[PDB]
Design a protein around this ligand. Structure first.
Ligand SMILES: [Mn+2]
Ligand SMILES: [Mn+2]
Ligand SMILES: [Zn+2]
Lengths: 166, 485, 49, 96, 763, 246
């Protein structure tokens, strides 16, 4: 239903309130995903197809030649195969002292790092912060999302699955 | 339309933030069931007074008038100088619990008044205790800000009219319709009481008309040059909300429950540059009707211009033919602006605007009724915009109203409800009578004595103002009442 | 009753026990006498036997 | 707890008198016809009758398409609707 | 002996039939078709429209009876209409978590044969708040009225009010002090409290003297009763006007409609797959100012709530809380009903706002809550008065999980990084300005900030997870019910979580004790740990701290014209009030949970309501937004550069503007610093693994894992696999040195006589 | 409408009349002479000897129902018989301080119009331990049964047991830990807990989960109920044998 430029504004954080309320209060537009993902595609500097957005600067992607599925930054860096935790192949900054917590919180409003830690996760090439965790000491890294990509495209969207190698 | 005046505010120091925090509430005021829970729907409007035009004085008065922190008058002088320097256009003062003890808030007001005199500037001051001496500070401050923001421009109007009329030989004082459906005097400085005076005019005429003809359940529908006003008369009465909201603002004045949507005969027809969709309003053309009137200087087409294209309006009978309305002006401006950017004929250009409005008004009227728990078949629909009889078919089609009535005097229907309004004066005095259940008949007569006194003190007030209006006590019918809990 | 410290002797209504409903008679006999020894409302079957 | 006291004061005033006209035939007078206008609704043009509001009589009926005009009110009855006037100068929209 | 339900069946037979059909068929009550809705759709919505308006209006009207501002102004009350089996048809808004809690009491009565004794009769009145049957906390009190028609039960009405206090050890409603049920306040288990529409004198006299704020409680009772009876009358008028046939069809077709509604919205808004997320909060009971009587309760601990969220191709979904930690000696435990209705209120706020709000979505969700976890205790000594501590820290994770599916699919308008910790709860007791025994409990934490979006900043001072219609209430009204005066109300700067879109900021309130006698106060929120996490970037909101000043010498300071503390505590790391109070005993620390503490007139208490987490990498935020945050008071200027890479210069007007070249270059430099200061996760992991093997962590970190492994073996298996730990490494809870009472031995309510409890959860 | 006491007067009118006589006269109820005792001293002592034996023997029997040794072996239980106005006539030995506590509970009901609401009906059962009305401590729980004759109240039976615990903060009966009423344990203010001789399920479930030593508490209820009902039955047999006048 929605105008294409209006779903762009929504991505750019610039959409008007009337259409923002319209989008929220009425049944969703079945066409959203295919318009959305195409909007993201034309904003990448690499022509490999996008399969699913993982964050603002993070995607599951289909290699134009090998047809493998991978996690990719917007800049270009492939982290891992899509069934793996990308964070395992990323770089991490751990805020575990009052000095580091007091860089992003005023004292007293910072968590205490013997109870809670800030783990920031960056792309190796561009330094982009794709995710920040707030667990305890010892706590494993978290595999956020394992999507059923086949069922989504095939059963919920009525679309062929993109070609896939291993 | 938030087109008021650049108004500033002085409140208690340390609490300057409360206006713009909107008591949280105002991020969901007037929300349908579904959006009250749909969290991502909540949204704050701009504050009436921004943070850089708020200031704070150091004073504190507790819930019974005791001055815990006495007013440090210096902080009031800097407060005044700050907003005078900021070129504020009016200054509002709201100090906590001033309704109970206004000493400190009226000293602040005097100090501010002093500083504006020295500045030479024309800045009026509004003490909340002088206007709305009632609890709940977000309600009181919003209402008082209204006197500065929006009331002040039309403050001239009631004295220009009343002067023009006594000059011309009237022997009465005008009354104004007020938010609770009753009339007040034109002299009152609380013009915000008279803010929904026009719409309430219509609701009262429809109420009156119903009483004569036995219609007890009436849905009122008014379409003017700018908006579409809608209320329900449920079993002979209107509903009056005590501490209501209106335009997503908490207010301290009792209000008649109504609703509207911002479309009317003069609402402007524009196309989104990117969507190329039609957006009606929200602004209107007003007494300038649109392009169809040659001398109006209006360049954007209005719904009234579609009326001419489609044959709804008679070009030679606007105001009885006292006003020249040219159809070909409407046709050329509809083509250039709407029809050709949309690849449609001027007929289909105009008909699609009217069709959208028809459905938009219809779905609103259906939904305000659904929302209040009623079926449209439980009601009779009075329609009386002055431009509403042009779309009675539209917003009523298939709703299932028991009957749909266009009275012949539809065009002045509010002015009909105003001439129909009771000549009534009301007077109030608060009290502190506390009784247990088990009480001896002496504490019981003492209580009845003090209430008996207040009615007599009030009774002489009603009669004394009716004397100044040329009415002896014999003509006044009196009805005492009281507030209990 | 299950948590108690004292018991009641009861003359068996059956010669021979055995089968389900017979255990039902033995509880029933008990209850009955407990009503006599004490008071009908003294009975607390919900504690078990 | 008695929290306040109130006093109301009414004086009589001429309220506007609602007409109570005798109702007559459903056929409106030839005097009330003021010609037609080109009227466009659902992709269709029709010659819609024009009626002088004041020249209508209690009991008349007006089948759409027609517009009812006076000095300052325009009452639209498209094709597919109908109106009749009662003794109180009220009209009634029917679906029809 | 005819049963009392409209059929002739008993309450128990009637519900047992309906749950069997539901189990066998997969549709509520077996309804494979919705006769009324499909065949008489006009009549179906007219009933819906007229009844849902009735309950909305009942809540709004009746709340004008209460003295407490919690009910009168904030609206912490709810009205729900139920069918015979205790399933909701419709509800007013407000604290709608009690849709399910009152539904479970109705079911507990059904399952324990209240029908035989004490009997469900027309005009009867039931009152209940028992947490062991699934209520949130004793301070939320239910009134339940059966509805009869032509001599048979056709449904129930429930009304809930949040009451100021229920006479726990702690003075307040979220009280600390007590550590078990015994002391956790006046506990009512489905009591018959009236007959023939009239209350029992022995209930009135007993109930009113078990609490402090008696007049407030008394009026909170009338607000419930009046609402129940407005709704009972509404139904009778609706049935008499449209017929029992239609009403009876509607009373059950509505509930399958709500299940159908959840399924369809999942399929249109979501992505099938698996979502993993976790949440924590602190319980610092070791500290000196948590004075609890039982020595076995003085240890620090952390609530651990992992959620495996499974979304299926058929549109059902599953929430598995394997790995979760144990209940404890505090007042933060919950109940399987508490927890699952909490998750339902969240889906009313994103998934189904525009569908039927009733138990339908409940029947369309799968819940696995291991027995013995805090969310499903197996002990009848457990305490509840502040369940929200844990509850609101678990549900916030699920916003994030559910938000990844909107984001991948393109419904960015619906992404939300999660709820604020709905906290600090200003509480205290003593003699008030009317010289009556009294207790306090500010609902200012109804207006915390909310999670940022993928589209725009979170709302500041706006909502709570348990009621999206935020209200902070007027200063002038609160001062009628507490013996305190406001010295400030202020947006709480840098409370919002940073990001591309900033989370909503909390706000702050500075109070002076005034006209109080023999008065105490305490604090109750999260301190050491932020419950919410940011999303796709995005940092947690600020955590909590305490500020109290005793012996301020403020009578003299006010009178002599000296500086006095006003507004908020703008930079707690560089405070301004402390310098002003050279004689005071100032408590300024992280201990966000305390017990009762003597206060006196002119002492100071800072009320702090939390912020919400943010979205995206902060140095993607638009710089102008950062500058506006600085002027608007939302972010302290210090972190403009340090967090967002935004360089700001103050103009002649004194306001901040953007230095654009500086801001670009600072962002360029931050990216290199991030490269330089991070390490491959391989590298970090072998470091943390060494700390684990060495058991290098505070006792509260080691207790969270020890207890969690024991309740959730699949979680221990996963930890051991992840860190590659030998089977020689073992973490027995008994080796940590801290008390471990209730870790092996426990006794459930269901082990008491005649108790039949209802199970709603996989367990 | 007509009061429930054997006279036709209400409980309140009945006691108010009797306390006024006592105030004006200096003798309980105005009795300047003792009709029965002076005129039929044989009948007077025969009633005395048979009724005091009844309460002694009721206490002794029913204490074999309890699991708690406090009641079963130590005998910290008491049974008292009262007139309509709540004055004791006779008691078993044991914890006889509750002669006065249960009397003050009976009188609290009289003064607060329990008769109008919740009503004192035959076969009803009251449970109470409220210390603000004059009970020693929450752990001493009263059962109070009215006794009726030909449709009118002629007196009450009270039974007391010391219970192991009532769910205070402290585990025990003489508990420390709590410092106010709030936390001092399950406090029952003259609750109607049964009718037609049967306990109410909502009282059963609620009360048993407010304490620790549940099985003990349950059986302490049955020891109380049984003694009351042995004593109610006793009186009726005494009255049926000797006459309501005597
Ligand atoms: Mn609550
Ligand atoms: Mn004792
Ligand atoms: Zn990169």
């Amino acid at each position: 239903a929605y105008t294409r430029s209006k779903i762009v504004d929504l991505v750019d954080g610039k959409i008007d309130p009337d259409t923002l309320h319209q989008m929220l209060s009425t049944p969703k537009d079945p066409e959203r995903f295919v318009t959305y993902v195409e909007i993201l595609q034309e904003r990448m500097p690499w022509d490999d197809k996008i399969i699913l957005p993982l964050g603002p600067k993070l995607f599951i992607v289909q290699q134009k030649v090998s047809k493998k599925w991978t996690v990719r930054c917007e800049c270009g860096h492939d982290f891992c195969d899509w069934k793996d935790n990308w964070k395992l192949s990323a770089r991490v900054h751990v805020r575990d002292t009052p000095q580091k917590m007091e860089e992003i919180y005023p004292r007293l409003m910072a968590p205490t790092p013997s109870w809670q830690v800030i783990r920031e996760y960056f792309c190796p090439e561009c330094g982009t912060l794709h995710d920040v965790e707030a667990p305890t000491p010892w706590y494993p890294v978290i595999h956020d999302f394992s999507p059923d990509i086949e069922g989504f495209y095939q059963e919920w969207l009525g679309l062929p699955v993109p070609e896939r190698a291993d | 339309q938030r087109k008021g005046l650049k108004c500033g505010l002085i409140v208690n120091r340390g609490m300057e933030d409360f206006h713009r925090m909107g008591r949280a509430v105002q991020s969901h005021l007037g929300y349908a069931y579904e959006d009250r829970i749909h969290l991502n729907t909540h949204r704050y409007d701009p504050p009436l007074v921004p943070r850089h035009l708020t200031r704070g004085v150091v004073e504190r008065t507790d819930m019974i008038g005791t001055q815990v922190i006495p007013l440090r008058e210096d902080t009031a002088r800097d407060a005044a100088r700050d907003l005078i320097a900021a070129d504020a256009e009016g200054i509002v003062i709201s100090l906590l619990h001033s309704y109970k003890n206004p000493e400190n808030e009226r000293r602040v007001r005097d100090i501010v008044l002093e500083e504006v005199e020295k500045s030479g500037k024309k800045i009026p001051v509004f003490a909340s205790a002088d206007y709305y001496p009632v609890r709940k500070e977000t309600h009181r401050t919003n209402t008082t800000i209204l006197e500065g923001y929006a009331a002040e421009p039309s403050r001239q109007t009631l004295s220009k009219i009343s002067n023009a009329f006594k000059e011309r030989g009237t022997k009465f004082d005008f009354r104004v319709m007020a938010t609770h459906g009753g009339t007040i005097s034109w002299k009152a400085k609380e013009l915000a009481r008279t803010i929904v005076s026009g719409p309430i005019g219509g609701v009262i005429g429809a109420k009156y008309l119903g009483e004569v003809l036995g219609y007890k359940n009436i849905a009122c529908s008014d379409i003017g040059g700018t908006s579409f006003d809608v209320a329900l008369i449920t079993q002979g009465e209107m509903t009056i909300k005590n501490d209501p909201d209106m335009a997503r603002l908490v207010l301290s004045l009792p209000l008649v429950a109504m609703d509207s949507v911002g479309a009317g005969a003069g609402s402007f027809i524009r196309l989104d540059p990117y969507t190329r969709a039609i957006k009606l309003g929200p602004d209107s053309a007003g007494y300038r009707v649109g392009v169809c009137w040659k001398e109006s200087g209006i360049e954007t087409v209005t719904i009234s211009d579609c009326h001419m294209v489609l044959g709804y309006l008679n070009p030679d009978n606007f105001l009885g033919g006292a006003v020249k309305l040219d159809r070909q002006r409407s046709v050329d401006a509809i083509k250039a602006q709407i029809a050709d950017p949309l690849g449609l004929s001027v007929e289909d250009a105009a008909a699609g605007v009217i069709e959208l409005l028809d459905s938009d008004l219809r779905d609103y009227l259906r939904s305000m009724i659904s929302g209040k728990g009623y079926s449209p078949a439980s009601f009779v629909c009075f329609s009386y915009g002055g431009a509403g009889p042009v779309h009675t078919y539209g917003y009523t089609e298939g709703l299932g109203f028991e009957d749909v009535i266009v009275p012949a005097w539809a065009a002045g229907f509010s002015a009909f409800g105003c001439a129909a309004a009771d000549f009534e004066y009301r007077y109030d005095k608060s009290l502190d009578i506390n009784m247990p259940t088990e009480t001896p008949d002496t504490d019981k007569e003492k209580a009845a004595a003090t209430l008996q006194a207040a009615w007599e003190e009030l009774t002489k007030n009603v009669l004394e103002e009716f004397k100044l209006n040329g009415y002896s006590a014999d003509q006044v019918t009196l009805q005492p009442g009281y507030r209990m809990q | 009753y299950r948590g108690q410290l004292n018991d009641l002797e009861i003359e068996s209504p059956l010669a021979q026990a055995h089968t389900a409903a017979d255990w039902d008679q033995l509880t029933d006999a008990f209850n009955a006498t407990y009503g006599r020894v004490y008071a009908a409302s003294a009975r607390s079957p919900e504690l078990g036997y | 707890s008695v929290t306040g006291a109130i006093m109301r004061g009414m004086v009589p005033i001429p309220k506007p008198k609602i007409p109570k006209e005798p109702e007559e035939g459903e056929t409106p007078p030839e005097s009330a016809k003021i010609g037609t206008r080109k009227f466009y609704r659902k992709k269709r043009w029709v010659d819609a009758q024009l009626y002088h509001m004041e020249s209508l009589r209690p009991g008349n009926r007006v089948m759409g398409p027609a517009v009812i005009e006076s000095d300052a009110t325009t009452f639209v009855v498209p094709d597919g609707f109908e109106t009749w006037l009662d003794g109180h100068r009220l009209f009634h929209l029917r679906e029809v | 002996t005819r049963g009392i339900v409209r059929g002739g069946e008993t309450l128990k037979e009637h519900r047992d039939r309906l749950m069997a059909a539901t189990k066998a068929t997969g549709r509520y009550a077996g309804l494979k078709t919705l006769e009324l809705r499909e065949r008489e759709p006009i009549l179906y919505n007219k009933l819906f429209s007229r009844l849902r308006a009735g309950v909305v209006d009942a809540r709004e009207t009746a709340k004008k009876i209460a003295a407490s501002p919690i009910v009168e102004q904030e609206g912490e009350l709810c009205f729900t209409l139920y069918n015979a089996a205790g399933d909701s048809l419709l509800t007013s808004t407000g604290i709608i978590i009690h849709v399910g809690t009152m539904g479970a009491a109705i079911k507990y009565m059904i399952e324990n044969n209240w029908e035989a004794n004490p009997g469900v009769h027309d005009k009867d009145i039931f009152c209940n708040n028992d947490s062991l049957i699934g209520n949130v906390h004793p301070c939320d009190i239910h009134t339940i009225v059966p509805i009869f028609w032509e001599g048979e039960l056709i449904g129930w009405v429930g009304g809930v009010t949040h009451v100021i206090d229920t006479g726990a050890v702690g003075p307040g409603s979220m009280a600390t002090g007590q550590v078990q049920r015994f002391g956790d306040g006046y506990s009512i288990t489905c009591r018959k409290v009236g007959a023939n529409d009239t209350l029992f004198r022995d209930w009135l006299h007993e109930s009113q003297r078990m609490v402090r704020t008696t007049r407030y409680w008394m009026l909170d009772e009338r607000t419930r009763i009046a609402g129940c009876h407005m709704i009972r009358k509404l139904v009778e008028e609706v049935v008499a006007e449209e017929g029992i046939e239609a009403y009876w069809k509607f009373a059950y077709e509505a509930v399958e409609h709500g299940r159908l509604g959840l399924q369809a919205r999942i399929k249109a808004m979501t992505i099938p797959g698996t979502y993993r997320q976790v949440g924590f909060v602190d319980v610092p009971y070791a500290h000196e100012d948590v004075r609890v009587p039982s020595d076995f309760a003085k240890l620090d601990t952390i609530m651990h709530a992992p959620c495996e969220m499974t979304i299926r191709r058929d549109g059902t979904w599953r929430l598995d809380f394997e790995g979760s930690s144990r209940w404890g000696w505090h007042t933060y435990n919950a109940h399987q009903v508490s927890f699952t209705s909490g998750i339902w209120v969240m889906m009313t706020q994103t998934l189904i706002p525009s569908e039927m709000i009733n138990d339908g979505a409940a029947y369309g969700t799968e819940f696995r809550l291991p027995k013995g976890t805090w969310m499903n205790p197996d002990d009848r000594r457990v305490a509840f008065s502040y369940s929200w501590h844990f509850l609101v820290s678990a549900w916030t994770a699920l916003w994030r999980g559910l938000s990844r599916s909107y984001f991948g699919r393109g419904y960015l308008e619906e992404v939300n990084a999660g709820n604020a910790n709905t906290s600090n709860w200003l509480q205290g007791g003593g003699f008030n300005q009317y010289d009556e025994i009294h207790a306090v409990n500010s609902f200012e934490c109804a207006a915390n900030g909310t999670g940022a979006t993928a589209v725009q900043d979170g709302l500041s001072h706006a909502a709570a997870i348990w009621n999206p219609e935020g209200d902070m209430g007027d200063m002038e009204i609160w001062e009628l019910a507490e013996p305190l005066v406001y010295l400030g109300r202020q947006i709480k700067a840098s409370s919002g979580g940073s990001g591309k879109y900033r989370g909503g900021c909390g706000f702050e309130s500075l109070r002076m004790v005034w006209n109080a006698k023999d008065w105490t106060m305490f604090f109750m929120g999260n301190g050491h740990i932020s419950s919410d996490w940011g999303l796709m970037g995005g940092y947690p909101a600020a955590s909590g701290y305490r500020f109290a000043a005793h012996k301020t010498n403020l009578k003299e300071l006010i009178a002599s014209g000296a500086e006095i503390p006003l507004g908020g505590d703008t930079d707690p790391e560089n405070p301004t009030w402390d310098a002003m109070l050279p004689d005071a005993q100032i408590k300024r620390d992280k201990q966000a949970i305390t017990t009762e503490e003597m206060f006196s007139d002119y002492d100071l208490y800072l009320n702090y309501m939390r912020g919400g987490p943010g979205f995206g990498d902060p140095l993607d935020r638009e710089p102008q937004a950062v500058a506006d945050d600085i002027n608007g008071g939302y972010v302290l200027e210090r972190f403009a550069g340090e967090v967002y890479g935004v360089v700001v210069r103050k103009g002649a007007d004194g306001q901040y503007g953007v230095d654009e070249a500086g801001t670009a270059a600072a962002r360029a430099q931050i990216r290199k610093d991030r490269l330089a200061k991070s390490v491959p996760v391989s590298e970090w992991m072998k470091g943390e693994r060494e700390k684990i093997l060495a058991k290098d962590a505070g006792t509260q970190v080691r207790q969270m894992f020890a207890a969690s492994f024991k309740l959730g073996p699949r979680f221990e298996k996963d930890f051991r696999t992840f860190w590659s730990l030998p089977d020689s490494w073992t973490l027995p809870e008994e080796e940590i040195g801290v008390p471990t009472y209730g870790s092996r031995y426990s006794m459930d309510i269901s082990e008491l006589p005649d108790v039949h409890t209802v199970q709603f959860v996989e367990e």
